[PDB]
């Protein structure tokens, strides 16, 4: 035979839309077409982020969008994830393109004079991406990450899943 | 020298390099071992290294030019036939009449029956 370091195994990268969502299937069909034809790194990025699992597409709040759009007045924030609403802080005027908008987030963005776009309108208006800012939410804020590891560790102890008689 | 029991090697002639590249030559293009069929495929792969035809590929290998490393690393390892390896067996050095070791210019006789 042949002395290979390792045998061929499936590459651990998603290439389609997870689940049976008919609309999310068409979005991947649209951006898989755009990235192949336009050969734009922006469409390759949006296509890749559309294929992540739900846990890997964390939310972005209106407060975080406002901070990132401060020095970008006429721009379009583009986050492939649900956009929630931070009720603690005001929402300025800005245009956001996202997969889904919370009822309160959509009201707040619209009431400020902004716009809530979907990814087909963004591809229709800015296919290769010209006045957009790519944004993704934080991943390590998940509480599940606290318990990972060994809680007896000297350096970075875990968080000891609560249970029988935990003090 | 360290891997002597597992290899036999020597110094090729120009005709040995010519026949190996022409018949068994191949290139790694986009991770695919594409056999050599035209100069355009050679120009595409090694155009940046001023090797635009199969004769630049043969000449560079034989004389070991400036871009030997890049040209040689593109050439996929040749797959050869079988042949009478030795006189006694391949468990002794060619100096003792065996199969492995440094055959010097005598490696061309072996390669003649092997290509």
């Amino acid at each position: 035979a042949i002395d290979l370091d390792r045998h061929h195994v499936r590459k651990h990268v998603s290439k389609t839309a997870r689940g049976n969502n008919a609309y999310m299937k068409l979005l991947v069909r649209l951006y898989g077409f755009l990235a192949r034809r336009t050969q734009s790194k922006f469409a390759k990025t949006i296509l890749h982020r559309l294929c992540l699992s739900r846990v890997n597409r964390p939310i972005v709040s209106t407060s975080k969008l406002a901070c990132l759009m401060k020095k970008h007045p006429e721009e379009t924030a583009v986050c492939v994830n649900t956009v929630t609403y931070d009720s603690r802080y005001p929402v300025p005027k800005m245009n956001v393109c996202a997969l889904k908008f919370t009822k309160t987030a959509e009201a707040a963005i619209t009431k400020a004079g902004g716009k809530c776009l979907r990814f087909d309108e963004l591809a229709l208006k800015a296919p290769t991406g010209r006045k957009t800012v790519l944004i993704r939410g934080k991943r390590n804020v998940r509480e599940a990450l606290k318990h990972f590891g060994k809680v007896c560790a000297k350096k970075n102890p875990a968080k000891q899943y609560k249970g029988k008689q935990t003090k | 020298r360290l891997v002597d029991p597992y290899v036999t090697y020597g110094y090729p002639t120009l005709e040995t390099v010519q026949k190996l590249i022409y018949k068994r030559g191949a290139l790694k293009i986009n991770g695919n071992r594409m056999p050599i069929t035209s100069n355009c495929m050679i120009k595409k792969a090694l155009g940046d290294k001023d090797v635009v035809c199969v004769d630049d590929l043969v000449h560079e290998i034989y004389t070991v030019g400036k871009h030997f490393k890049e040209v040689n690393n593109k050439l996929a390892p040749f797959k050869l036939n079988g042949a009478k390896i030795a006189e006694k067996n391949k468990k002794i050095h060619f100096i003792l009449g065996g199969g492995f070791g440094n055959r010097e210019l005598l490696i061309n006789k072996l390669l003649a029956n092997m290509i």
């Binding site: - | 069929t37 035209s38 035809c53 199969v54």
Partner: protein, 101 residues
């Protein structure tokens, strides 16, 4: 497929065709010369086989120049053969001493 890969094949093929035709003529014309030289040698041998013709009488000394010239060369070329023969003799002496240690 060879022409497509190496367009210089036609140029090199023609030279191979020329040399093959030319080398055949040289060997063919050298054979004709050697037939005459062998014919000359045969005549000298058959004529000197008559040393059998004849109580010994001073054995039989045979003439030194029974072999006849077949090709003709100028005197300058005649002197060059004696020069060439001296060199090939010196080279053999040069080589024999070297391997003789």
């Amino acid at each position: 497929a060879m022409v497509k890969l190496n367009p210089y094949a036609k140029i090199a093929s023609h030279k191979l065709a020329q040399v093959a035709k030319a080398q055949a003529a040289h060997k063919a014309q050298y054979a004709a010369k050697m037939e005459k030289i062998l014919a000359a040698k045969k005549e000298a041998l058959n004529q000197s086989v008559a040393k059998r013709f004849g109580g010994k009488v001073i054995k039989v000394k045979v003439e030194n120049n029974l072999l006849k010239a077949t090709v003709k060369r100028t005197a300058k070329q005649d002197a060059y053969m004696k020069k060439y023969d001296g060199i090939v003799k010196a080279n053999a002496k040069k080589y024999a001493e070297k391997i003789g240690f």
